Amino acid sequence: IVGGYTCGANTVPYQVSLNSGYHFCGGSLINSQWVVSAAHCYKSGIQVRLGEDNINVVEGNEQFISASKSIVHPSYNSNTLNNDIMLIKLKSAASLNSRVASISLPTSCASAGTQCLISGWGNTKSSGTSYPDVLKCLKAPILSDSSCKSAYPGQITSNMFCAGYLEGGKDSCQGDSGGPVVCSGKLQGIVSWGSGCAQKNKPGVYTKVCNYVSWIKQTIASN
Ligand SMILES: CC(=N)N1CCC(Oc2ccc3[nH]c(C)[n+](Cc4ccc5ccc(C(=N)N)cc5c4)c3c2)CC1
Ligand SMILES: [Ca+2]
Ligand SMILES: [Ca+2]
């Protein structure tokens, strides 16, 4: 996250770190046994880390659980990143508390101009590299579809939306991938892609969760 702030330990209770010997992607807890993340974060041997603040310090509120199953969307296209969403089932149920909570799925899509909260442990530099140890947060509005498509001609599908600031300076970045975009208390996006981070006229691109609710609910119920 570039131009964001330190969230504060366990202020984003649904945020999860995906670890395979190190942090590689974020994710969201949707219930005691399932996490939603980006299909492009798929890896074999994932461990889910919950209630995390500093990813390099064990502060006592963490729950580390291995994944039993990973399901990438049936129509995920790695070339275009269309349908960039995957579900992860935990080996055992997480214990929910003040610092580990699930986020609700939306009952409808969000309007452009709606303010959202994006979070992660990704790079904090526009052009350079600096990875934080603590969770970073960022408030950003959903951009109009025309602004999104103008920034990335021929690359935006109906399963994507843009959020941020056209003037640059504030955005999600690499390391944030699979992380939550919460608007009006519902999970509306997953950190997917972009061009650089916080560059002018190149806002972040997110998977549009409101289009996958029925697939998420049907998949979870049969697995
Ligand atoms: C051809 C086509 N439809 N596309 C070109 C390729 C693809 O964009 C990609 C695809 C694969 C990538 N692999 C990597 C490492 N990047 C850079 C990458 C990855 C994730 C980001 C998340 C947020 C942001 C952000 N600026 N908020 C930038 C990112 C940049 C990537 C960016 C999706 C769109
Ligand atoms: Ca801390
Ligand atoms: Ca920790």
UniProtKB/Swiss-Prot annotation:
Cofactor names: Ca(2+)
Catalytic activity reported: Preferential cleavage: Arg-|-Xaa, Lys-|-Xaa
Modifications after synthesis and translation: Subsequent cleavage after Lys-125 leads to alpha-trypsin. Further cleavage after Lys-170 yields pseudotrypsin. A cleavage may also occur after Arg-99.
Biological processes per GO annotation: digestion; proteolysis
Positions annotated to bind Ca(2+): 52, 54, 57, 62
A Pfam cross-reference name: Trypsin
Annotated S-S bridges: 7-137, 25-41, 109-210, 116-183, 148-162, 173-197
Subcellular location field: Secreted, Extracellular space
Active site positions: 40, 84, 177
PROSITE patterns: TRYPSIN_DOM, TRYPSIN_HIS, TRYPSIN_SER
Keyword list, A-Z: Calcium, Digestion, Disulfide bond, Hydrolase, Metal-binding, Protease, Secreted, Serine protease, Signal, Zymogen
Listed GO MF terms: endopeptidase activity; metal ion binding; serine-type endopeptidase activity; serpin family protein binding
Modes of activity regulation: Is inhibited by scorpion cyclotide trypsin inhibitor TopI1.
Family classification: Belongs to the peptidase S1 family.
Protein name, per record: Serine protease 1
Organism from which the protein derives: Bos taurus (Bovine)
